Design a protein around this ligand. Structure first.
Ligand SMILES: [Cl-]
Ligand SMILES: [Cl-]
Ligand SMILES: [Cl-]
Lengths: 227, 221
């Protein structure tokens, strides 16, 4: 039958879309991948299957039912090989409907665009399909830059951005497990990351740019938004 | 009281988050800006107050402060995700500076309204997003974004020829496929295809609003 490629959001089940929620409650089968929060899965009463060899495993269930749900973290169309799964499915006649989600890029609550600091932003992956390194040159000077899958390679990424002209004193922020109870924010200047001084564990969202300090009190290092 | 800065999604009410929906259904007052979809607004039973502008903002800030002080909580509804392309950062800053508690509720950003892949093996390993209209109606310095594999432009229909020309001036491929998704996330959604060249030449017809995606992913379909 039909495959609904659904964004699970960054983690907090409340950030599921109304559409995603209804499809999860109603789906006979939910093919999820690693990126999916336990709280969101617990909302699905149907068959939960942890899911190329991912593609064919998708095809089999799509055929077994009237429709199935293929659940991916954040929004399915960015940084998740969603495009690949869509192609494969369409090429095998399987209809596909995409249900956008709250991308993790937006899970920090910070204004990625802000008057006088950034009029746009860019997002890039530290790991490519195949395991390679990203070409950071087209991204090096965007005022606000967000990096996904950049924790393991943070030193190399930081050094490369410094080489490409980013400000070594630029404030940056790592948000580990954003949206969840284990969310831990790590503040560091770009140079401190390049110097291998920052401890961070994946998965983590990495935001670089002055917007990072937008809600910091003037009179002290206090995050006015959090408090 | 508290202010919830809430993302309305790109248009389709079904793309509201559970959290945004819960808040909209219970808010005594909803302060919405111009780009919030009609269908979303109709779901809110409380007092609906237009607090927006078409590119003043200090006025908007004072209105937000006035309503927030008169209720246990209010909802400040914005199109897409409240924290990108809507001056949400300024609104939150002003409120925090006035001692008003604020909670941000992310949304499905308009950048993602077309359901098309912005990143794709071999074509784009990241993307950039920019607006054709800045704070105060200013024009954007496109130099930082000109070469990103996949570029998405919001509010770029009116100034599409200038934008395309700037992009060409800044090094972007003239033959690059682009796509306009007119009235994305609505029943009236329409798609227009064209190479960067055609836009720069004034050969493309699109009426606002529209989401504009540039890059080889457009032809991945
Ligand atoms: Cl995502
Ligand atoms: Cl370390
Ligand atoms: Cl948005």
């Amino acid at each position: 039958g039909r495959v609904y490629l659904v964004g699970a959001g960054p983690g907090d089940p409340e950030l599921l879309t109304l559409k995603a929620y209804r499809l999860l409650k109603e789906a006979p089968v939910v093919l999820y991948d690693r990126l999916v929060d336990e709280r969101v899965l617990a909302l699905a009463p149907g068959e939960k299957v942890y899911v190329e060899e991912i593609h064919r495993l998708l095809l089999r269930h799509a055929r077994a039912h009237p429709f199935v749900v293929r659940l991916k973290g954040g929004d399915p169309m960015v940084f998740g090989r969603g495009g690949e799964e869509v192609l494969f499915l369409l090429r095998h006649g399987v209809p596909v409907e995409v249900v956008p989600g709250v991308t993790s890029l937006l899970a920090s609550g910070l204004p990625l665009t802000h008057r006088g600091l950034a009029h746009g932003f860019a997002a890039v992956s530290g790991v490519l399909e195949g395991g390679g390194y990203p070409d950071l040159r087209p991204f090096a000077r965007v005022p606000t830059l967000v990096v996904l899958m950049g924790v393991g390679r943070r030193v190399w990424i930081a050094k490369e951005l410094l080489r490409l002209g980013r400000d070594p004193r630029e404030p940056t922020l790592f948000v580990e497990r954003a949206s969840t109870p284990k969310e831990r924010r790590v503040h560091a200047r770009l140079e401190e990351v390049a110097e291998g001084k920052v401890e961070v564990r994946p998965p983590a969202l990495w935001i670089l740019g002055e917007v990072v300090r937008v809600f910091a009190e003037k009179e002290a290092p206090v995050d006015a938004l959090a408090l």
